[PDB]
Amino acid sequence: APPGKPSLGWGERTFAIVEVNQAATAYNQLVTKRDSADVSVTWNVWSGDPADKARVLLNDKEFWSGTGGAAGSASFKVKKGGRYQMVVELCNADGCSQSDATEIIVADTDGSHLPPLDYNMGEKNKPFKQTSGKVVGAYFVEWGVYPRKFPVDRVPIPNLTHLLYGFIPICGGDGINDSLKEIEGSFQALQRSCSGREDFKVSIHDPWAALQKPQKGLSSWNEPYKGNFGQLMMLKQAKPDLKILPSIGGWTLADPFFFFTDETKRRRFVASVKDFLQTWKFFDGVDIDWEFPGGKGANPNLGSPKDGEIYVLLMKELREMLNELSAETGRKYELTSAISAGWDKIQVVDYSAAQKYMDHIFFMSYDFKGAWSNDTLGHQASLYAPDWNEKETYTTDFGVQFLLAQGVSPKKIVVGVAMYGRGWTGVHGYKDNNPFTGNATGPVKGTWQDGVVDYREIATEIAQGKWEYHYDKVAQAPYVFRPATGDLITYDDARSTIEKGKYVRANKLGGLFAWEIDADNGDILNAMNMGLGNSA
Ligand SMILES: *[C@@H]1O[C@H](CO)[C@@H](O)[C@H](O)[C@H]1NC(C)=O
Ligand SMILES: *[C@@H]1O[C@H](CO)[C@@H](O)[C@H](O)[C@H]1NC(C)=O
């Protein structure tokens, strides 16, 4: 005659290892990284021996032992998230009794409590299989969920191996992150998020988009993690082998890096990064987009020859930080970086020395030519130099060789692909029907900001005959031209992306990567894995 069947009393059945204040605007008030979740039960058997023994069972393995007996309560620690079956067991001299199981959710940024992401392969995306063994990466921007309507559930995930999340900002006010003042509302936004937080620690530029904004699958009022991070958690559960990296910096956010000559700040940075990774477990390492060591970035008042040395010390300590994290986590972390393809910026850093600590070098072989000049027109992301300009040194090919010349091993170089277009308007005074010899009166009409056009748009407008398509066979780069208004646009397409693929394969490079994922209709990513020799 075992004791009576226990009846649990209702308490909340959702707990969080990492807690998120779904109503905060600062980062310190937003997230609490805890080491374990506190789970509490309350049960009751009417008229029972209170000296009976009692156990709480999560998925039929024991988590708590006591007496309880009749009308009892138990609290305990759980260190790994998931969806559990909770049972309270009573025990006397004859046998045991169990209660009807109830499901609880221990949430963790692991994604353990979540189902796999439900993704979309819309548009011209065809499913591939990562048989190449080569890197196929793409950038996902944080702000892409507002007027772009590109949530994480729209990423064609079977066609990537790595995924870069842009961007992770670094705390700091006046002087430290002045580059954000160029973009409306951004500086004020970071300052809100970094309020009460020491400068030179990592944070989140937009807490709403990252963790609070309701997207597909995460609409509930009681979802601990939502937004982009929420869906990124659902992604590691769809494709566990898909590397998801956080990108720190970028063009308008790289300003604080120039202060890392200071031992004190660089150690505080690396520290906050370590916690950042423990706080957000779906990440698989660190990506550093310092633009650029030495200068020539957004801020004209920042830069130093000594920057090249601090770049090599930052990666040495970041690697060590990840090493002693692998120790504790038992996991592997990738350390990567997006560097310039300009030889004048490559010079500053000894990448042959930095490569010891790194895995992947995202060679930004794009943005060579743009609307920031009226009379220097050219190819933005061409492979080689054009016929009319043989001594062009800002090409994909030249930069790679220049980087290889340092002593960098080719397996670590990941060539960049442009999923967008840089353009001009009012091109005039050109010769031989070659618009690049002409000059422009301004930037072309842009998709979001003028001077930049999404490939999605370009491809559509070509099929409507609103453009003239030309392909430079020598430089391996397409462009479109409208003789009337004098509009000229540089970009990458299917053809040139394949040739970047052949180049990587022939020269035994690392693979390809694209900026940005939402500017594609599926044609360039397809060219990316056909060119790298993937399977369909
Ligand atoms: C291009 O030309 C227009 C008018 O000639 C001028 O307003 C603009 O500042 C120029 N842009 C650059 C980058 O020189
Ligand atoms: C374009 O601008 C440059 C500026 O130095 C000038 O030398 C050149 O003649 C211009 N080309 C035309 C076709 O006006």
Short mmCIF file of N, CA and C and ligand atoms in Angstrom, two decimals, residues 375 428-430 437-439, ligand 2:
data_model
loop_
_atom_site.label_atom_id
_atom_site.label_comp_id
_atom_site.label_asym_id
_atom_site.label_seq_id
_atom_site.Cartn_x
_atom_site.Cartn_y
_atom_site.Cartn_z
N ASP A 375 34.29 61.86 -60.18
CA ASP A 375 35.16 61.66 -61.34
C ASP A 375 36.04 60.39 -61.31
N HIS A 428 28.74 61.80 -67.83
CA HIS A 428 28.91 62.55 -69.07
C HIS A 428 30.37 62.69 -69.48
N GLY A 429 30.59 62.99 -70.75
CA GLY A 429 31.93 63.21 -71.25
C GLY A 429 32.76 61.95 -71.34
N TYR A 430 32.10 60.80 -71.40
CA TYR A 430 32.82 59.55 -71.55
C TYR A 430 33.11 59.27 -73.02
N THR A 437 34.91 56.38 -68.04
CA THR A 437 35.86 57.45 -68.32
C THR A 437 35.20 58.81 -68.11
N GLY A 438 33.88 58.80 -67.95
CA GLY A 438 33.12 60.02 -67.75
C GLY A 438 33.07 60.45 -66.30
N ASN A 439 32.36 61.53 -66.03
CA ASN A 439 32.17 62.01 -64.67
C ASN A 439 30.69 62.10 -64.34
C1 LIG B 2 36.37 64.64 -64.98
O1 LIG B 2 36.92 65.36 -63.87
C2 LIG B 2 38.34 65.49 -63.90
C3 LIG B 2 38.74 66.18 -62.61
O2 LIG B 2 40.14 66.38 -62.54
C4 LIG B 2 38.76 66.27 -65.14
O3 LIG B 2 40.18 66.37 -65.19
C5 LIG B 2 38.24 65.57 -66.38
O4 LIG B 2 38.54 66.34 -67.54
C6 LIG B 2 36.73 65.37 -66.28
N1 LIG B 2 36.23 64.65 -67.44
C7 LIG B 2 35.29 65.16 -68.26
C8 LIG B 2 34.89 64.28 -69.40
O5 LIG B 2 34.81 66.26 -68.07
#
